[PDB]
Amino acid sequence: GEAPADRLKALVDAAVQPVMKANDIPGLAVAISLKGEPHYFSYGLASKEDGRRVTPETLFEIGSVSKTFTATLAGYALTQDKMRLDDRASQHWPALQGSRFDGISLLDLATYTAGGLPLQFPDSVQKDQAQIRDYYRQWQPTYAPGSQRLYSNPSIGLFGYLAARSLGQPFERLMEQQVFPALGLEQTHLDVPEAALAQYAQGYGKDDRPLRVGPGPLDAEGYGVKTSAADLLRFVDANLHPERLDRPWAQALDATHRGYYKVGDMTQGLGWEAYDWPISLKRLQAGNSTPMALQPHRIARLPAPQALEGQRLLNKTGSTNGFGAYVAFVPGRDLGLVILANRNYPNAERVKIAYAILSGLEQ
Numbered sequence: 389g390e391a392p393a394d395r396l397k398a399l400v401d402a403a404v405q406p407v408m409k410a411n412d413i414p415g416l417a418v419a420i421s422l423k424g425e426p427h428y429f430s431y432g433l434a435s436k437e438d439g440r441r442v443t444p445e446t447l448f449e450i451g452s453v454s455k456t457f458t459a460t461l462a463g464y465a466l467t468q469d470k471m472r473l474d475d476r477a478s479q480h481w482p483a484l485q486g487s488r489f490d491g492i493s494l495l496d497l498a499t500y501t502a503g504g505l506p507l508q509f510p511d512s513v514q515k516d517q518a519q520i521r522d523y524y525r526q527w528q529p530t531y532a533p534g535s536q537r538l539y540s541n542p543s544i545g546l547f548g549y550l551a552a553r554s555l556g557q558p559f560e561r562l563m564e565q566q567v568f569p570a571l572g573l574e575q576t577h578l579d580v581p582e583a584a585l586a587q588y589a590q591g592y593g594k595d596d597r598p599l600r601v602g603p604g605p606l607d608a609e610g611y612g613v614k615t616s617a618a619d620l621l622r623f624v625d626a627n628l629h630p631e632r633l634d635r636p637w638a639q640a641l642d643a644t645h646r647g648y649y650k651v652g653d654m655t656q657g658l659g660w661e662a663y664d665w666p667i668s669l670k671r672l673q674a675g676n677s678t679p680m681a682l683q684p685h686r687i688a689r690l691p692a693p694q695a696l697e698g699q700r701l702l703n704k705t706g707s708t709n710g711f712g713a714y715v716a717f718v719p720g721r722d723l724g725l726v727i728l729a730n731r732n733y734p735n736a737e738r739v740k741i742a743y744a745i746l747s748g749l750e751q
C-alpha cells in the first residue's frame with residue numbers, strides 16, 4: 389500500500405516544517421536510513437536569490453560533523469599501526485618537541501581533554517603553517533591534560549593533522565584520495581570542484597547575509613567538509629555496517645565507536661558523541677547544549693573503552709557561520725538520520741527535528 393510512504397512523509401514533514409518556519413531556515417535536506425533503505429525529503433531553497441531548490445544532491449557545509457571524518461582517518465592511522473592513542477603529540481611533529489605537547493596524548497587531543505585548548509583558534513592565527521606551528525609551540529594548559537573536556541577545534545584539528553603526518557601525507561590529500569573513495573563518497577568535498585559548484589547551497593546569516601566558509605587554520609580537519617544529504621547518509625550507513633567495507637576501513641570506522649569517558653549523559657568517542665537510547669528529548673538537547681559546547685566539564689573516565697553500539701544513539705552537530713547540520717544513528721536498530729540546513733539554527737532545534745523522526749520510526 390501507499391500507507392507506509394505516506395506515514396513517513398507525514399512524520400518528517402511534521403518534524404521539519406515548523407522548525408524551518410520558526411528558525412527561518414531557507415533550505416533543508418533530510419536523509420533517513422530505515423530497514424536498509426534510504427529515504428529523502430527536501431525542503432525549500434538552496435539559494436533564495438536564484439530560486440534553486442534543495443535536493444538530496446545539494447551540497448551543504450557540515451561544519452563539525454567533519455570531525456567524524458577526521459576521526460575515521462585517524463582510525464585508519466591507528467589500526468594501521470602508524471600511531472597509538474597514548475602517543476605524545478610531539479612524537480608526530482618535531483616542531484612540537486620541547487613544548488607542552490610533550491605531555492599531551494593523541495587521545496587528549498581527539499577528545500578535547502588536552503587542558504583547555506579553546507573552542508576556536510584565536511583570530512591572531514590565520515590559515516598559515518608557521519602561525520599554526522607557533523601557536524601550538526607556545527600554548528600552555530590551564531589544567532592537567534586528561535581531566536576536563538573543553539570542546540575545541542584546535543584540539544581535534546591537531547589530532548587530525550598529526551594522524552596525517554603519521555601516514556606521511558597531507559591531510560587534505562589523504563581525505564580526497566583515500567578516505568572518500570574508500571567510503572564510496574563522490575559528492576563529498578573539502579574543496580568543491582568547479583563542476584560541482586552549482587550544487588553548493590548558499591549559507592545565510594544575520595540579515596540574510598550570504599555566508600560560505602572562508603579559509604581558516606586547520607579548517608579541513610575541523611570543519612571543512614561539504615556534502616549532500618545522500619552522501620552523508622552513505623557515510624552513516626558505513627557507520628551502521630562497517631563490516632561491509634574492506635577490512636582496513638571497517639576497522640577505521642570501528643575505532644570511532646569507542647567511548648573513553650562520560651560527561652553528563654554523553655559518552656565521548658573519536659568524533660561521535662553517544663547516549664543511551666531511549667533517552668528523553670530534554671536530555672538529548674542538554675547533551676548538545678551551549679554550556680556543553682562552551683564550558684569546561686570534569687570527565688568521568690571509563691576503566692576500559694566502551695563499545696558505542698546496541699541501545700545507543702551516536703550523534704554529532706556541526707555548524708559554520710551560514711549552516712547547521714546534525715547526524716544521528718542507532719546502531720542496534722539499523723536507523724540513521726541526516727539533517728542539513730543553510731542557516732546556523734540552534735542545536736536544540738536540530739535535535740527537536742531528529743527526535744520526532746527517530747521516535748516515530750520506533751513507533
Ligand SMILES: *[B]([O])([O])C1=[C][C]=[C][C]=[C]1
Binds near residue numbers: 452453507611
Ligand atoms: B563545529 O561546527 O562545532 C565547530 C567548532 C569550532 C570551530 C569551527 C567549527
Ligand SMILES: [Cl-]
Binds near residue numbers: 508509541610
Ligand atoms: Cl577554529
